[PDB]
Design a protein around this nucleic acid. Structure first.
Lengths: 56, 77
RNA sequence: GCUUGACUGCGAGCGUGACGGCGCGAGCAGGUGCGAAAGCAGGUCAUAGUGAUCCGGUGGUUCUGAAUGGAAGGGCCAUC
RNA sequence: UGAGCCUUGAUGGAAGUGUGGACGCCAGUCUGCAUGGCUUUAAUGUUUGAUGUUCUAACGUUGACCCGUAAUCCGGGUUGCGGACAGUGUCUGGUGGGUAGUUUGACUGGGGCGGUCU
RNA sequence: GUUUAUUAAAAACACAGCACUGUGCAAACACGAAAGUGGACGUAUACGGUGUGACGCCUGCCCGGUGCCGGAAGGUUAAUU
RNA sequence: UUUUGUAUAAUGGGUCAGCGACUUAUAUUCUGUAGCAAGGUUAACCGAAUAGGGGAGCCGAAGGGAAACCGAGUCUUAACUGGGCGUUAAGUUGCAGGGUAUAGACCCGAAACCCGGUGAUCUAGCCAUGGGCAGGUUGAAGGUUGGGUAACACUAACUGGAGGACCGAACCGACUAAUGUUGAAAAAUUAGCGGAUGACUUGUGGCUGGGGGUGAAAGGCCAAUCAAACCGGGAGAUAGCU
RNA sequence: AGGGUGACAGCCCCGUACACAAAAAUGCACAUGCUGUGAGCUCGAUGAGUAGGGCGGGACACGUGGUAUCCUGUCUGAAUA
RNA sequence: UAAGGUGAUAUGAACCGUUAUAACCGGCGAUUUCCGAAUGGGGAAACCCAGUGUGUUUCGACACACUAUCAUUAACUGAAUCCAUAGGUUAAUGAGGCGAACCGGGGGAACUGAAACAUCUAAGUACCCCGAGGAAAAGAAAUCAACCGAGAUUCCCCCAG
């Protein structure tokens, strides 16, 4: 399970960085609780197009 | 009905097989669990009866998409 | 005393078994020991001292080897 | 807390009035504390496994409550108690006459016992 | 009291009594691939299992074997890696 | 019929009639016979349908060697004076028959094993709800009261009315004998006999179903059967036996 | 062809060969209407918890074998002309 | 179509009919009790008991029709929880059961053979279960071949015991 983050979130968080997180933590807390999202690739651009249409 | 709501997995039959190679009818059955999935698209908890694997399928494809089927296929949820 | 004939390939022609098989055999080829030589030696005076087939192991051998070259596996000789 | 990497103090702006730790060639000198015109060493940040607490958010509830619902089922919801335990799938070692399928030779002055079986 | 309905009614079974043993309750145990249920609307003065078999006087020694109970060293030891 | 042997006092058959057991298919070989002959012959299918077409193919004219391969030879071995198997006999396709192979394979016969149904109207146990026990005894606790004690104890009458208590009918059982035993009866009759307010007895209905039930436990009972029920099915199980 | 008729029938009867038939309801064919329905070209796109793998089984004539291929209960998990 | 007719055991009775409404055959329609899927509820099948809307110069009561379940859809309603969802009522479609074999799938024996027996066999047979058609199923290559080339599935004969 990978998923990219929304909010801060401790020991990993970063408003949209690319973290690899244990299966459960995510499908059980990180989401269905807004704080991250399946790195569905459709997303790794969806949320990289920011790291371009922004930080440059 | 030990049956995975997402993947179709039901129990299957096979043999056991001693060293003596003795056939004895058995059953393999799905690692089922029935989980409380958060939808939000419905602001609710749909709880499916799932196989780890089904769960992986949900974890991939995505819940709203899985729930898409079933409904697409008549199933309850 | 000197030795490795307790040799390898074969074998006219006999025995004895329902059969699987066992047994005796001079002689031919290669190569060897003993003996000056003629010559003797294919274990032990003889007759007991043993276990088929399968499967598998070990060595040797291109005989085979599923498109081709190889390989795996199979065969063949030895052996467990 | 076992082990790797990054590093800032060890092997590979002077002299004097003053300090903890020590394989210190057996009797050193240091490694630091104050001042005064790629390989043998200590803690951080870590990465990586083990052990331990506690948390809650999977999961359990054969506590209480709300509603569907004039309902000792069920479902949803709230709350409390537990809690990543328990349990269940797959694999795996043990136990397992509870259940199962079977085996348990022939000869023989009947059979068995004894003996015998090339 | 019970029993072999149809060759056995007994000295067999059962019994109150006794002992051992298990069970903290979603009990053990039992029917059931499960859900559900008996136990029990009971809760260790209860529930199950096993033996003994009113009552009196009593019930000695043995723990090697087999069974069972406990054992946070070591040896040996599965999947996995 | 079986047997070394059977008048045999060993088997079978009361008798007559009808029926009743070596078959069919496909393979494979041999014999007979027919055709063609170093060749014989087609299968499916086509079809102008018992013709004709179709020669895919099969068998045979060449073996030896594990094989590569060689080839009237070849293999064995370095090679055999040699050895083994071969070269010197005509096949093939129908048709009838003799054997075999697979099939129930000559006919009939098990005790059983497996699957799926039907059965607690008999019986076992339980649940619910209802019914029944003539007559006659014994006379527990407790109570009253007198006697009695310092008070209790204790004691006598009475009163009371327990009990898997007694005797004994109905009711429930079934210890002995006799009869019966092609019965009156597939378990009884008759004389005796145990229980008879209880762990009693009994009506109606309900629940438990086969490796299952139920069992105060005999392997007892589960519809005249039970060390695994009845029915249908696997099924023509298998039978080296008769 | 066959059947029947007082015994065995081409010519007695019913048939057979042969040639004929439907107001109706239907079957199949075509031709047409209706509602649909999409046709042709150019530029694209080209099936992930999937293939593959560990384990356990199962299926392939193939009984784990040296064992390809296929399905998958369980754990995992690619490339992208 | 017709000069004969009202099926049969099975006569008789009383009748019908002869040129087109006797009968007879066939097409299409009417009617079609109760039980039975059985469907208003129940139930020991062929019986019991309703509710709702209707209807009677005699508008008590007794006739007629609707009212099962499930699925899809819609309309109206509508909780814990305010929106929503759940739920509820109604309406329209549909299904339901029966029955040869053949067919596809879920599950799946034993005797038996191996002259015992466990791997193996019998066999994916019998049997049970679900589903469907007139056929089913399968089907247009991540197939085979083998350096030439074939060109989906199905079926038959060889290949070959």
């Amino acid at each position: 399970m990978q998923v990219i983050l929304l909010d801060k979130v401790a020991n990993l968080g970063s408003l949209g960085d690319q973290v690899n997180v244990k299966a459960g933590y995510a499908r059980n807390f990180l989401v269905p609780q807004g704080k991250a999202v399946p790195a569905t690739k459709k997303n790794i651009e969806f949320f990289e197009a920011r790291r371009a249409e922004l930080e440059a | 009905s030990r049956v995975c709501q997402v993947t179709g997995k039901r129990p299957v039959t096979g043999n056991n097989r001693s060293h003596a190679l003795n056939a004895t009818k058995r059953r393999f059955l799905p690692n089922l669990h029935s989980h409380r999935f958060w939808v939000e698209s419905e602001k609710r908890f749909v709880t499916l009866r799932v196989s780890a694997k089904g769960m992986r399928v949900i974890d991939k494809k995505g819940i709203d998409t899985v729930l898409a089927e079933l409904r697409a296929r008549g199933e309850k949820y």
